[PDB]
């Protein structure tokens, strides 16, 4: 009754009382899920924060899905960079509590994280990247779908690069790139991923993004050279070698120090690979051994 009233003061007071109740008898508090969801449409930010706390205390296996969907709709219709950041942090905490305890449909959760990546200007994009990495590494089963979605993200990098701020949208590229490189075996169309990573737009990315890019790109080159030599496509190996030849000199002039160091050693490695393949050496095994040493 008090929440249904228009006086925001007693509204917040009753919400605090309901929070105290939820600490011992949420079994009845759950009945007010729709009401507390509706409470998010008020104007008092502390009231929304209290409602988010009530939702967090209310989540179980049976209700996470629709609660997450409603929070999705709200944060879509929400305004305010700080308020949106608070909403994103809250939903991440809610879904992550007890090692994603209430999540059985992790592909749906990955889809949620994918649509969350579209939250422009979020200051916790690094947290989004961390969630991506955690889910993809831990959930072995859905890794193929994860790789496909993160490849789509790497394709959308041309738009995602409009904001290269620290811990911002760009860290989505970090997570997607690392997962795609380390689970390259699920690549349906790999050379598109190569060329997209070979797009000159990467020169405008933050240095750490460029570093993970070049590292998993040479991992991709190892995988592609392995596929070419196993199939026997020597000419495809030559084409890939020229592709490595004509792209690294772009990267060696990057402003980031470590990025240009690793680009330079990669370029000299590519020169050695060309020299070896000229006399027909299956160098793909040795190159792939540089990455197969770790899986987790």
């Amino acid at each position: 009754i008090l929440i249904e009233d228009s006086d925001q003061n007693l509204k917040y007071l009753g919400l605090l009382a309901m929070s105290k109740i939820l600490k011992t008898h949420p079994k009845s508090v759950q009945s007010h899920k729709d009401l507390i969801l509706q409470c998010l449409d008020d104007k008092d930010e502390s009231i929304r924060l209290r409602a988010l706390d009530l939702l967090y205390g209310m989540v179980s296996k049976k209700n996470l899905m629709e609660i997450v969907k409603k929070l999705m709709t709200h944060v879509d219709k929400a305004e305010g960079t700080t308020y949106r950041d608070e909403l994103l942090t809250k939903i991440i905490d809610i879904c992550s509590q007890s090692n994603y305890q209430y999540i059985t449909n992790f592909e749906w959760y990955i889809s949620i994280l994918v649509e969350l990546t579209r939250l422009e200007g979020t200051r916790h994009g690094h947290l989004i990247a961390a969630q991506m990495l955690d889910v993809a590494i831990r959930v072995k089963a859905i890794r193929k779908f994860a790789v496909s979605q993160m490849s789509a993200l790497l394709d959308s990098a041309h738009l995602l690069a409009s904001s290269t701020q620290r811990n911002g949208i760009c860290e989505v590229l970090y997570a997607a790139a690392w997962i795609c490189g380390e689970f390259s075996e699920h690549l349906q169309e790999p050379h598109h991923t190569l060329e997209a990573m070979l797009r000159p737009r990467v020169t405008t990315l933050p240095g750490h993004i460029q570093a993970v890019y070049v590292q998993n790109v040479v991992k991709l080159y190892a995988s592609i050279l392995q596929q070419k030599e196993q199939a026997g496509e020597a000419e495809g190996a030559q084409a890939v070698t020229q592709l490595m030849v004509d792209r690294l000199p772009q990267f060696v002039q990057s402003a980031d120090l470590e990025v240009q160091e690793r680009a330079s050693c990669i370029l000299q490695l590519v020169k050695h690979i060309q020299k070896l393949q000229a006399k027909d050496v299956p160098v793909a095994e040795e190159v792939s051994a540089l990455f197969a040493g770790e899986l987790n």
Partner: protein, 587 residues
């Protein structure tokens, strides 16, 4: 209205509006306008206000016009009521009242009133009252903003407008053209000469938009002057705008500057720089945009700002961004003929209280040293002396610039790296620590006797170091292994084990790459045998190019290159034609 409940105040306002007394009407309307001003929701009071939309008391008229303009888009049905009063006002013998009625009738965003508005613009089209004509041009833009589907009719009426000889309508009509149909280069062809001739008479803001529109179509009709004989129409454009350069409206100044920059031949454009620099005397806000645009220019034509070098020196009262942009311009303008004074002023600048300014200045010194090789030795001397400073940020930025300079010149300077190693015990900033580690790696064979000491110190500090510092430690460990494994293999294995359990998976991938590459193994093939070439490869020097090199495709003076983003609604600027089209269309 008094100190009471807001609801009761709104019903009281209902009473004052409803009263036949004039003064009560004025008081209520003033209170309602004030409520609009503070963002209070007055939408509940629309029906009470709308009744007075025909009052004969003129200030009440203006206030109710304000209210209708404010709240029309919410109460669609209620807002319909004022349209008849507007219709009648459109026929009044007083033309100023007609202009006011036209403004409001355009302004109402009720989708039902589309046809009557269309009729209204068509009727105002030839009102024979030029003030009504200017308001008609604005109303045309209004209608296009409200109804896209009337574009052909709006184009027709605007084509009607352009032929007007009245000086006080041309600018607004051109504004309307830009707003509705930017690509109709066909229409203005006949009007070019009269627009150019009357440019000097048009009002200043209309002048600004007119200058930009002239720029846009000129850069498609005319062919790059930079034997070539200038088209007399092109000469007409240049010479007609030439007088404007001394105008007091700085926007007009920038408009004519842009016109000359993208139109006037390079052997004549040098004049615009004097006006561009005198713009700097104006307010600081104008300084931001003008200075940024001057910087954009500077990375092509170094001569155009050469004679005015001193005018850009940094002055302590300037804000941070003013100092930054001024420093970038001063960077671009440098050459051998003046580098001594410039370095002296840089040296004074370095000691500034604005630490960010000091860092930027140090970066500028590095860039200019890379530009003019004949001064690099003194640059290194001064920069190394700057290491003597006690500030952490200062010494760190000097670290970065020193490493860049060594990248430029890998000569015999092991004394520098020894000094850097001694500084390591004091250096805190992650990038600087990783930097001096990398520098040690690049010349470890020149000082092998200290390398294991720093190596073991960093191995002890590894878990607390930065991920960039950790990656540099990994590279140092790889190089030191490949050089002196017999002394360093235990520490290298320690670092490898440390990285093996590091949470950073990028660090883990680098660690596994390094371990597989340098550690002999079962598959230690040819590539592993090239590791000594791999980690000791010679690397090219960095290119410290100005960020303004990327503003060439954005037009100077538009919002886009100020934001370095293709701002919405911007129009891409055409390359010069191979051959000019039929000159007759300009006749």
């Amino acid at each position: 209205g008094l100190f009471s409940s807001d609801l009761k105040k709104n019903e009281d306002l209902k009473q004052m509006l409803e009263s036949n007394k004039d003064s009560a009407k004025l008081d209520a309307m003033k209170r309602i306008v004030g409520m609009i001003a503070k963002g209070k929701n007055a939408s509940e009071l629309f029906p009470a206000v709308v009744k007075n939309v025909a009052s004969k008391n003129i200030e009440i008229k203006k206030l109710v016009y304000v209210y209708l303009v404010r709240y029309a888009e919410e109460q669609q049905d209620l807002a319909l009521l004022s349209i008849s009063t507007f219709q009648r006002a459109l026929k009044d013998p007083n033309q100023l009242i007609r202009a006011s009625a036209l403004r409001v009738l355009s302004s109402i965003r009720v989708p039902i009133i589309v046809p009557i508005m269309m009729l209204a613009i068509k009727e105002a089209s030839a009102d024979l009252s030029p003030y009504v004509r200017k308001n008609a041009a604005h109303a045309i833009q209004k209608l296009y903003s409200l109804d896209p589907e009337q574009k052909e009719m709006l184009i027709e009426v605007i084509e009607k407008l352009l032929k007007d000889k009245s000086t006080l309508v041309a600018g607004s009509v051109v504004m309307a053209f830009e707003e509705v149909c930017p690509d109709r280069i066909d229409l203005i062809h006949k009007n070019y000469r009269k627009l150019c001739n009357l440019l000097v008479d048009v009002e200043e803001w209309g002048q600004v938009v007119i200058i930009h529109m002239l720029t846009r179509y000129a850069r498609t009709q005319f062919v790059s002057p930079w034997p070539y004989t200038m088209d007399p129409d092109h000469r007409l454009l240049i010479r007609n705008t030439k007088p404007l350069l001394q105008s007091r409206n700085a926007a007009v100044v920038m408009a004519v500057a842009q016109l000359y920059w993208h139109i006037s031949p390079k052997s004549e454009a040098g004049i615009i720089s004097k006006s561009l620099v005198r713009l700097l005397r104006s307010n600081r806000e104008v300084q931001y945009i003008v200075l940024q645009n001057i910087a954009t220019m500077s990375i092509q034509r170094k001569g155009m700002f050469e004679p005015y070098l001193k005018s850009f020196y940094v002055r302590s009262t300037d804000p941070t961004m003013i100092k930054t942009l001024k420093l970038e311009i001063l960077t671009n303008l440098a050459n051998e003929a003046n580098i001594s004074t410039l370095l002296r002023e840089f040296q004074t600048y370095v000691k500034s209280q604005d630490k960010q300014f000091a860092a930027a200045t140090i970066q500028t010194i590095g860039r200019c040293a890379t530009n003019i090789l004949e001064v690099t030795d003194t640059c290194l001397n001064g920069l190394v002396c700057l290491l003597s400073n006690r500030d952490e940020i200062v010494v760190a930025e000097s670290v970065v610039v020193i490493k860049k300079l060594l990248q430029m010149q890998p000569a015999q300077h092991g004394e520098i790296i020894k000094h850097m190693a001694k500084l390591l015990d004091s250096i805190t900033v992650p990038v600087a620590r990783a930097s001096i580690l990398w520098l040690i790696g690049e010349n470890c064979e020149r000082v092998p006797k200290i390398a294991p000491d720093v190596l073991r110190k960093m191995a002890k500090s590894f878990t607390s170091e930065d991920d960039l510092v950790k990656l540099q430690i990994l590279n140092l460990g790889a190089k030191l292994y490949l050089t002196n494994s017999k002394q360093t293999k235990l520490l290298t294995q320690y670092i490898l084990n440390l990285g093996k359990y590091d949470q950073n998976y990028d660090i883990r991938d680098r660690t596994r790459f390094i371990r597989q590459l340098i550690v002999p193994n079962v598959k230690s093939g040819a590539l592993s045998k090239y590791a000594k070439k791999i980690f000791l490869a010679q690397k090219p020097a960095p290119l410290l190019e100005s960020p303004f090199k990327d503003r060439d495709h954005f037009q100077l003076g538009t919002l886009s290159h100020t934001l370095n983003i293709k701002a919405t609604g911007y129009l891409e600027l055409s390359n010069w034609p191979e051959v000019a089209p039929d000159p007759s269309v300009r006749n």
